Amino acid sequence: MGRILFLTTFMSKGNKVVRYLESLHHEVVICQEKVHAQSANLQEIDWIVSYAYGYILDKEIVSRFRGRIINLHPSLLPWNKGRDPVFWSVWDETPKGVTIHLIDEHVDTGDILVQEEIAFADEDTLLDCYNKANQAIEELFIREWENIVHGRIAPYRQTAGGTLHFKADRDFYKNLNMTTVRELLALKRLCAEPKRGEKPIDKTFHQLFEQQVEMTPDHVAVVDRGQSLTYKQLNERANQLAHHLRGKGVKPDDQVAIMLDKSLDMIVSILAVMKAGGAYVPIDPDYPGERIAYMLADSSAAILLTNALHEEKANGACDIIDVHDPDSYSENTNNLPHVNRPDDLVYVMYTSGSTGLAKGVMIEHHNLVNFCEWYRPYFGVTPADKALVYSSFSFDGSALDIFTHLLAGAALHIVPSERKYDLDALNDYCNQEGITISYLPTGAAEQFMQMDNQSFRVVITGGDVLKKIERNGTYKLYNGYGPTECTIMVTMFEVDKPYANIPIGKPIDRTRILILDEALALQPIGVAGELFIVGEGLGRGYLNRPELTAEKFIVHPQTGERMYRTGDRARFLPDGNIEFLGRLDNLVKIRGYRIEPGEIEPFLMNHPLIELTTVLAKEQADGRKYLVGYYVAPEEIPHGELREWLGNDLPDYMIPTYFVHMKAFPLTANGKVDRRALPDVQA
Template sequence: ALSRQTGSTLFMTLMAAFATLLYRYSGQSDVVIGSPIANRNRSEIEPLIGFFVNTLVLRTQLEADLSFEQLLTQVRETTLTAYEHQDVPFEQIVEALQPQRSMSHSPLFQVMFALQNTPMGDVELPGVRLSGLNANSTIAKFDLTLSMAETPLGLECEWEYNTDLFDKSTIERMASHFENLLSAIAVNPRQAVSELPLLSATERQQLLVDWNDTQVDYPQDKCIHQLFEEQVAKTPDAIAVVFEQQELTYRQLNHRANQLAHHLQTLGVKHEVMVGICVERSLEMVVGLLGILKAGGAYVPLDPSYPTERLSYMVSDAGIEVLLTQQNLLPTLPSHLAQVVCLDPDGGVIESHSPENLVSSVSADNLAYVIYTSGSTGAPKGVCVAHRSVVRLVQNTNYAQFNAEQVFLQLAPITFDASTLELWGSLLHGSKLVIFPSQVPDLDRLVDVVSQHQITCLWLTAGLFHLMVDEYLEALSPVQQLLAGGDVLSVDHVRRFRQRYPNCRLIDGYGPTENTTFTCCYEIGQTQLQQTVPIGKPIANTQVYILDPQLQPVPVGVTGELHIGGDGLARGYLNRPELTASKFIPNPFSSDKSARLYKTGDLARYLNDGNIEFLGRLDHQVKIRGFRIELGEIEAVISQHPQVSQVVAIDREDISGNQQLVAYVIAQSGAEISSTEIKDFVKEKIPSYMVPGAVICLDSLPLTPNGKVDRQALPQPDMSSMSSGDFVPPRTHTEAVLAEIWQKILKVEKISVRDNFFDLGGHSLLATQLSSQISEALNVKLPLKSLFEASTLASLAEEIDNISLALQAFQNHSVTSTATDLEEKGIL
């Protein structure tokens, strides 16, 4: 009925719906689909027996606010135009457009759609009974083919798919979503294509409700310091904090924090007042943090090693009026107007105050701390976190075990929100907290501290975890719970750790500062890991939604942006109302009008079991020569190489001013690996446009002070160092001419005949230039395919010489088969 109303055919309507499905699944607004056509548009050929079928390439451009009716109009016009040119062979179109070719997929399109709506007449032969035979194909001709047919029972669908790309459950879901889509289109064709429902009611219930059923009771109306005081009453004489040779019991820590809090209140500290704390690692650091909270204030950690300009900005932006520090740091502090309180012996001023608990009006909704994180504008932004968010992290939660038997290591800088877990996960449960003595993690010292204090609960960034597994795996024997995260965990390192310590709880923790340290956790058991380590499921009192740009939940297996809700959400960004409004949005799935979601900018997808796979950052999504690429995908592929320990992929500007991919690789301990070997491995798994232009082998990856990979500090690739082995100069005229052309195009000073064009930074765009210059210098028309098949200088020179000889033979009529050979090579 819809087709008749809009003057469209059934094929056009189904094609528009299929394009909508692909748009919703892929997030791509430019969709190209192939479709076969009988190509019998002349009456003279209708009765002829033969195969006249041609392939049409139908391009559909979708926009979020486009209604299906509008899309159908576009598809109708596109299809009618294509019908007018159906005589043009598909091969001729490919030749004219010259798309980048790959052996892994067909050119121009990788998805086919076909509708069989021509009635099949009965064939009768005397003495013979005929019946239809369904031929089952075992080889997919395209990545995905949807074949539909009109039958007396309605429309039938057959899905053919490449099993390297899809599994059966994915195709079954896709088929179900296509059916849902068609039903929704029939009901309301004026609805925007971005809003047409894909999911069934059961799927929505699973994604939005069942997998977010995380609510548990916890002391949500209590503050951090109140819970600490309750713990002091339970275990007053237990050791609370250890720093080198010093230690404080819970009672002693409480008394000292109370004295400081009384003093701070005399300076005007109360709820919502921000107090700076710029101290070295020490017992005073913990006393200071706890004292600020007891006074009702919120602590703002300031790292003494930060540049003065950055500290000055943070002090000014937070409006800090009281600053806790130490005598030896006074000369390094930026100019400010805050009242300074030195936590080391202060003439007895602090000690003169009462050690008794304070009475304050602070509530769980008041600020506990403001932590500054890097901002895209270059200036750091302060994330404001309330008491309730911290309590939700460490009280009655489900991802780790907190109790008085644990010995925590306080390793993270207090400017990094992992310290929230270490500090309050320990001190609110009667555990012993050991403060790491050095401001910057030192592996040798870390090993000593873990051994000396028999650390049982340890948080490591992914970078430190990898280093420990590589260098000091045996030193982790006391650890009973190891939480790692902050970056992507290497599957290889996880496997090695699990093999050595099968009884230690290994937990992959994921979460932005804006949701108080942890959002999702995945306990890594003995089960077989795939290509990546999942980030797991939302922790207690946390909701996670994977949504498309229109805030619609995406199906299982489909990539979307991860959004977070629940009690861990920060209040927002300090003094940044516009940024807060853009990142903390109303929660469309909650009946509570005040509920919000945080847009993480992280790409993720649900796995079949409800666990979540992290796929990278939206801002790690790059375009290289027109192709949109997820850097995380390249990293995942390279990490599958058995000799690779870690990998980071980034995009950089190459010698010609274009963006190119660069991979930085660390080999397994004791292994040797070359960039050529990595490229050869990767070429087998991903399209050529995703193969890094340079692979750089490093001994270690640079880390930020927080232990994450410092992408800005990764070295620039030196293409001259990509030369293959010993230098062999050009030996023939052709090699000499080629070397000169390569030097000019690749901007590399010395070219060996063994060098590979692509290993030196070449890519498809530069290959096109190379082909043109070869034609001009050597008078040989070289197909682009030859450059990919013969990519070393020596092999390419040999190919050119062979072509020249064949051309001469053809011109001299000395070889009869030469013309056919040259035609097949694309030279004639």
């Protein structure tokens, strides 16, 4: 009857459409590559049918077959024009359907011939939807085809609007072809940028602090031994010092080093630096002078705020201002004119430096403000609260102690490093003064659970792997996670019940967390990946290490968002909470499978009688490694039972081949388990 040209690049040559036309005595030419107007294949062509065609036809060809070029697009046009239509139908939650239409000069904008709605089940995979839409449009083509040939159908224009997507738009969602419609949308909720956005931050910390002083000026803000300062007193004195600092040339983003012990002068010093305009650089005086001289060198601090006692530890490195010299304080008690922006620096804190050299982490005001603004309502902090200034001067945990509670109008209690280690005398101090909320490093926290405490209402911990929950006190227990690079913490979890692996919770305000794979593509919920952080938590980066900064604070290839590569390994749970799964460079090759040893420790320890476990990886010198299971228990446990115990919750390739019983572990000075001090096993 007529010779038809079938254009497609994805579909098989033996699609139902191809055979139905052959059944009607039509010659079907198949062509899966771009074609030009010169090609003689055009001659003796009565109809051009395209179906999943991956090229465009020259405008010279569309003008010669006007009214004779037909295309099958498994979408309910104008929705989901372009590439990967079925997918974007599910992701963007558009109307579902399939359309047979005329081609035109643009992408799937031509007039419609026949249109039919389709439905996708919440349990269908995306592959299922792809195949059902193909199955539906094919059958629709067959039904109305004769109505196409004789052209009796009246073409109608597309509804206004619709969406469009391009070829590469799907690169980010590549790992989801086999995921479910329900599971997919769930991933969209947890990771997609919210359409409705929380207002950005337009305030510096000292702005908000100065507001709090006007509201509760005579409230005690900080207590050290018997001495105390009110919000007004603290504000006026910090103002006096801040004037002297700006007169000495302090300008925004300038660094000012502070070297003091926990005291009132420390709090005055911190606020004075902010108010002047700059960011403060805490230097614990009990550091090796080697580190002190390095922190002072890497930091551009021309000024040093410090004590007569600790003055010399600088070795005349920088200009010194004595917080005990009455001439370092100005006559002016008024707040200074604000010169800062929220993206100016507020503080610079240095990393451990155990692996590599110590990096100076730059944190901006808006980072700190966002956390303190999330902290106040989340934990219901009120002026009636009292918090410990416990963590060290130069750890972001101190930023929590001081700043969160100051903007809530609460009362800070200085902890002398003298009373810091004797947690028993510390508990006595807490119950006496009525301490209600505070952050304690893990272990320091786990120890405090042994003490009978009645004062606390909330204790917050994190930074290490929490493993003990039972506690004497009547207070809620919270566990959170986050690198210093992203301002204190970016997630929090309320420890309601015991867990083999205690989750790290859900993100805080203006923060999103993405579990991505090695290609930086999305992982379905429940699938482990690298934890990426997004939003207002991300600091500026490392000081004087720009290349290194751009390695960790990336511009995502597909998304374009700024994100922090944590190097950590985690996954989302069904209820939305996040679960930490160890570091990423701790991975090793085990029978052709990438595995994190230590991901097994929770399951072992979950067994009733086992109390402490650490699984390691040892090489046989044959380029092959094997897993060894170390566990403390009353007595030996048969290899057949443990292999079966883990088998319930773990694959077979993860189950360790060797198990080692020991009545105890060589705990290091820290109190944790020394991984290397354990015995080795050959095989």
